[PDB]
């Protein structure tokens, strides 16, 4: 028996020595040395320092450049706001509580901080899905005589909020729960504990399927069709060197987008799966911290891939950073 448990938490450490305390009450320095709490804080520092400028700049630059506010960019903006939720509701809170060595906001602070942290990265996730669907629709022309416009772009945005609430909202109400995780400085969905009172198991399956497999399948199909449609067009177009270039950059970009999505949700998936089928086994605080390291840094690398590497956005950004000229 691997940890000690309480009404609102599970500490990944044995109380056989009597040292374990509520993560809502006193420091966890038995889970990990204090310098490791500092490092965690240092990491949270990095993600704010990078995550905020680059995500905020995105909103700002949209405000400054008229050519940027277009229906196809709506979801990219949504990604930026999602990342910001991750930055404030999650990264900073964690910076703060890490410096105490425990979650100082208590069980209700846990629910809130957990809800927003989850809402943020889930909006971001479904944003990546919706974007792909749209790009599939617009470039692959699967529907006849259909033109994508303002009213579709709204729904796409709205659809990511309904999906994200469909994930984040249930633990507030008794389907799973929010509890401190890892080093217990931050709160997340309990996918690792078989807490039957909240039905944690049926939720982790529903998470695994609806919020992971569906996204993975849609994103592969949509971008798959695209790298098809564009490779087809170039082969029928070879007299055009530009169409040749295009098919080459779109493919590279789809490889980056697809690998990036995996690097973000695969650890959380691989770990959730392994724990589910490994149930007698003991999982340490730092190990539970790993798939979280991965999913959180997306708040930086996502807008670099999806914003800074987007030609139009990057130009307006260089204009704005460069004091209006260039």
């Amino acid at each position: 028996m691997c940890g000690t448990e309480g009404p609102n938490f599970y500490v990944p450490f044995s109380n056989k020595t009597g040292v374990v305390r509520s993560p809502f009450e006193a420091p966890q320095y038995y889970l990990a040395e204090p310098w490791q709490f500092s490092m965690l804080a240092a990491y949270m520092f990095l993600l704010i320092m990078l995550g905020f400028p680059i995500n905020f700049l995105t909103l700002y630059v949209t405000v400054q450049h008229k050519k940027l506010r277009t229906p196809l960019n709506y979801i990219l903006l949504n990604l930026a706001v999602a990342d910001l939720f991750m930055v404030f509701g999650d990264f900073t809170t964690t910076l703060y509580t890490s410096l105490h060595g425990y979650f100082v906001f208590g069980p209700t602070g846990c629910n809130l901080e957990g809800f927003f942290a989850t809402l943020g990265g889930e909006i971001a996730l479904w944003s990546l899905v919706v974007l792909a669907i749209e790009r599939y629709v617009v470039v692959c022309k699967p529907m006849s005589n259909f033109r994508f416009g303002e009213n579709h772009a709204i729904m796409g945005v709205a659809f990511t909020w309904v999906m994200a609430l469909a994930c984040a909202a249930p633990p507030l109400v008794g389907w799973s729960r929010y509890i401190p995780e890892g080093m217990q400085c931050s709160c997340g969905i309990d996918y690792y504990t078989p807490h039957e009172e909240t039905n944690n198991e049926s939720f982790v399956i529903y998470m695994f399927v609806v919020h992971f497999i569906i996204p993975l399948i849609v994103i592969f199909f949509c971008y798959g069709q695209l790298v098809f449609t564009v490779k087809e067009a170039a082969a029928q177009q070879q007299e055009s060197a530009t169409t040749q270039k295009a098919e080459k950059e779109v493919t590279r970009m789809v490889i980056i987008m697809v690998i990036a999505f995996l690097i973000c949700w695969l650890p959380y998936a691989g770990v959730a799966f392994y724990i589910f089928t490994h149930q007698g086994s003991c999982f340490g605080p730092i190990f539970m911290t790993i798939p979280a390291f991965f999913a959180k840094t997306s708040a930086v690398y996502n807008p670099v891939i999806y914003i800074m590497m987007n030609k139009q956005f990057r130009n307006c950004m260089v204009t704005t950073l460069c004091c209006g000229k260039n």
Binding site: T70, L72, N73, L76, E134, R135, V138, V139, T229, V230, A233, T242, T243, K245, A246, E249, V250, M253, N310, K311, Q312, F313
Partner: peptide
């Protein structure tokens, strides 16, 4: 397609 590729920020 290049026109729609441009719209999507892909090229």
């Amino acid at each position: 397609i290049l026109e729609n590729l441009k719209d999507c920020g892909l090229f």
